[PDB]
Amino acid sequence: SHMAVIRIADERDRVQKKTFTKWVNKHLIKHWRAEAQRHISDLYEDLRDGHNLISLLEVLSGDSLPREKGRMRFHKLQNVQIALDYLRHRQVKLVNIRNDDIADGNPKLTLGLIWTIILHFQISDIQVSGQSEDMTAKEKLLLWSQRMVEGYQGLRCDNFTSSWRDGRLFNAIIHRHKPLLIDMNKVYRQTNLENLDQAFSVAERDLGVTRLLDPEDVDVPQPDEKSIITYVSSLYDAMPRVP
């Protein structure tokens, strides 16, 4: 039923919005200016005037950016363009996004923009042995993921969706780095949620990785790709060495 597919597609979007919202908040709070340490309530509303966008880029780059102090739409578009122009200076190719779209809270383009920023700042230097230079950041992260669970019995990482549903990969990657923290023998028998909860809990408590995903989000036949990548990438950053 087409109704089933839309249901799943809408669900993946719900998860992506929740994920990017947590990711943005994670960084915004690290901003040096107290009043810039804002909290996003609705990703489709709190980036519209451009201020949080500028703050996000400042925190991620350490670079200082100007801000319009007016309230006219003209000021908002300009505020948004400051952020968009910085990304271009950074040689980031902007996909299909206009000032107007961000100023009007365009859902898809807003998520698209946050995705672009995540990709550029968090998934820009993955290094993995066996790496082939032509590979994209996404392809590199997938190889790193595969390289990481290499020596584990019967578990493959064919992608950034279904492959991560049962929590097995998440636990193996943690174990690979801190075996004394994960009982791999037990992760094979227990439920998907059980594995997901454990992984996210250990990652946070012992590796200091923010819990971007809820086990309930990932235990679906096709988890949201970008949500998975985003979190997996933050797992990579918690790793001290390169496989």
In sequence order, the 6+-apart residues with CB closer than 8 A to the CB of 4 are none
**Resolution of the PDB structure in angstroms:** 2.2
* Same domain for 144 and 105: no
Q: Phi and psi at residue 84, in whole multiples of 5°?
A: -65, -40
CATH of the domain at 58: 1.10.418.10
d(CA 163, CA 116): 23
d(CA 65, CA 122): 20
- Cβ contact 187:167 at 8 Å: yes
Number of neighbouring beta carbons within 10 Å of residue 217: 21
* Same domain for 113 and 21: yes
Tokens of 14: 């719900």
* Same domain for 92 and 150: no
In sequence order, the 6+-apart residues with CB closer than 8 A to the CB of 207 are 174, 177, 178, 235, 238
d(CA 22, CA 43): 10
Tokens of 173: 């990657």
Q: Report the alpha-carbon angle 34-81-42, nearest 5.
A: 55
Q: Kindly list the distances between the CA atom of residue 154 and the CA atoms of 27, 60, 148, 172, in Å, as whole numbers in the listed order.
A: 37, 38, 14, 11
Tokens of 64: 């200082």
Closest by alpha carbon to 149, among 131, 122, 174, 172? 172
Closest by alpha carbon to 13, among 103, 136, 110, 105? 110
Please indicate, yes or no, if residue 242 is contained in any of the structural domains. Answer: no
d(CA 39, CA 24): 9
Point out the domain boundary residue: 117, 151, 183: 117
In sequence order, the 6+-apart residues with CB closer than 8 A to the CB of 105 are 44, 45, 47, 48
Number of neighbouring beta carbons within 10 Å of residue 45: 11
Please indicate, yes or no, if residue 61 is contained in any of the structural domains. Answer: yes
Q: Is 152 left (phi over 0), alpha (psi -120 to 50) or beta?
A: beta
Please indicate, yes or no, if residue 59 is contained in any of the structural domains. Answer: yes
d(CA 36, CA 172): 38
Please indicate, yes or no, if residue 241 is contained in any of the structural domains. Answer: no
Tokens of 34: 């107290």
> Experimental technique used?
X-ray
Q: What spatial distance separates the first Cα and last Cα of the chain, rounded to whole Å? A: 43
Q: Kindly list the distances between the CA atom of residue 59 and the CA atoms of 1, 26, 28, 55, 243, in Å, as whole numbers in the listed order.
A: 45, 10, 7, 6, 29
- Cβ contact 48:105 at 8 Å: yes
Closest by alpha carbon to 24, among 14, 16, 35? 16
Please indicate, yes or no, if residue 19 is contained in any of the structural domains. Answer: yes
- Cβ contact 65:89 at 8 Å: no
CA dihedral 144, 197, 163, 115 (to 10 degrees): -70
* Same domain for 133 and 113: no
Q: What is the 3-class SS of the chain, one letter each residue?
A: CHHHHHHHHHHHHHHHHHHHHHHHHHHHCCCCCHHHCCCCCCCCCCCCCCHHHHHHHHHHHCCCCCCCCCCCHHHHHHHHHHHHHHHHHCCCCCCCCCHHHHHCCCHHHHHHHHHHHHHHHHCCCCCCCCCCCCCCHHHHHHHHHHHHCCCCCCCCCCCCCHHHCCCHHHHHHHHHHCHHHCCHHHHCCCCHHHHHHHHHHHHHHHHCCCCCCCHHHHCCCCCCHHHHHHHHHHHHHHCCCCC
Estimate to the nearest angstrom the gap between the alpha carbon of 140 and the chain centroid.
15
Residue ranges making up the domain that contains 168: 129-227
Closest by alpha carbon to 184, among 148, 238, 225, 213? 148
Total domains in the chain come to 2
Q: Kindly list the distances between the CA atom of residue 119 and the CA atoms of 20, 86, 141, 188, in Å, as whole numbers in the listed order.
A: 12, 15, 11, 32
